[PDB]
Design a binder for this molecule. Sequence first.
Ligand SMILES: COc1ccc(S(=O)(=O)N(Cc2cccnc2)[C@@H](C(=O)NO)C(C)C)cc1
Ligand SMILES: [Ca+2]
Ligand SMILES: [Ca+2]
Ligand SMILES: [Zn+2]
Ligand SMILES: [Zn+2]
Length: 171
Amino acid sequence: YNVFPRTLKWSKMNLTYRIVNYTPDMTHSEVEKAFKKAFKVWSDVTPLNFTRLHDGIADIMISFGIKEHGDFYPFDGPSGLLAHAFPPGPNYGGDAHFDDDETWTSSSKGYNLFLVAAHEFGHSLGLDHSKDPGALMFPIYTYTGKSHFMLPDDDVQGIQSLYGPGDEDPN
Ligand SMILES: COc1ccc(S(=O)(=O)N(Cc2cccnc2)[C@@H](C(=O)NO)C(C)C)cc1
Ligand SMILES: [Ca+2]
Ligand SMILES: [Ca+2]
Ligand SMILES: [Zn+2]
Ligand SMILES: [Zn+2]
């Protein structure tokens, strides 16, 4: 049973994460919405368990990425790359990093963390992608997390069904 390596949705009904998008044009209050609110929408599509244990137990997080890997250069102006997320494995999984050279906000101008973040998190915690037809995963985001409707049902029901109940049980 193996074909397209894109799903990672089975044994992860609950996970922890950290909120630290950035403080460019928004304030601690906005980032609070970006990370929380965007999470409110992600939870709306799927009852995913998320906990930010500052104690040091986080798997995914929202934060502006700044070239710190050592392989490919993510940050790069408005280039085709606003949010790169990693697989929830080591302490660098579900790492939601936005091309620091891009723009992010919680208002009607630019990428709304609700959208971008709900999208990056959907990846960092979800998997490679899941919107062939239409979901909050393609390089297009136009409709904010809630600026019209769940057009991207692919990500809505997609993770609402795959990330819904977790298994983490080998038969
Ligand atoms: C809200 O929907 C979107 C979220 C994030 C992006 S992105 O960060 O610009 N980007 C999409 C993309 C850009 C260029 C080429 N291919 C894809 C991310 C992404 O997919 N994040 O989930 C890339 C860098 C992986 C776009 C829309
Ligand atoms: Ca870019
Ligand atoms: Ca991590
Ligand atoms: Zn990064
Ligand atoms: Zn995507």
